[PDB]
Structure 1
Amino acid sequence: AKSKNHTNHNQNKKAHRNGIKRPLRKRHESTLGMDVKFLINQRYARKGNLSREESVKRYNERIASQKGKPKPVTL
């Protein structure tokens, strides 16, 4: 027989009882399914981060090897 197949009464009273449950706000998120390198490049820049204080100044002195960079403003 036929009384009540497929209703929605009590369905958002239930879904609002142990309530509606926003997901999350995660600082870091999974990189699962990203562009696969991209991520091998960032896995190569993550290793080579070596200078905190030392070489990070030094290459400006190497900029002055061409007395700076007058020319490469174009490309």
Structure 2
Amino acid sequence: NHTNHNQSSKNHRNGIKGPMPLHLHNSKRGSWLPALVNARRVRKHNQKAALKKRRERIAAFAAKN
């Protein structure tokens, strides 16, 4: 006995939770490789840069302090 009655009011008790925003689980994975294989190598460099930018900081913040 199919009814669908009380179901729309069950889905709205604890609320129909809104979707997660885009900054949640934005895993550009399973997508088109030639993009993510480039958006990978550019992440490696931008991490060598993030590590390098902190290296001068501390060393500038040492001598210049």
Structure 2: unaligned runs, 5 residues or longer: 54-65
Deviations 1:14-69 (A, max 9, x none): 0000111112114251112211121111212223344x7xxxxxxxxxxxxxxxxx
The sequence identity of aligned pairs, in percent, is: 49
Q: Which residue in the other structure is 1:42 paired with?
A: 39
Matched, 1:32 2:29: yes
**Structure 1 match to 2:9:** 13
- For 1:11, give the aligned amino acid: Q
Structure 1 gaps of 5+ residues are: 53-75
Q: What is the TM-score of this pair, normalised by structure 2?
A: 0.57
Higher gyration radius (CA): 1
The normalised TM-score by structure 1 is 0.51
CA-atom RMSD, angstroms? 2.1
Whose RCO is larger (CA < 8 A, sep 6+)?
2
- Report the count of equivalent residues: 48
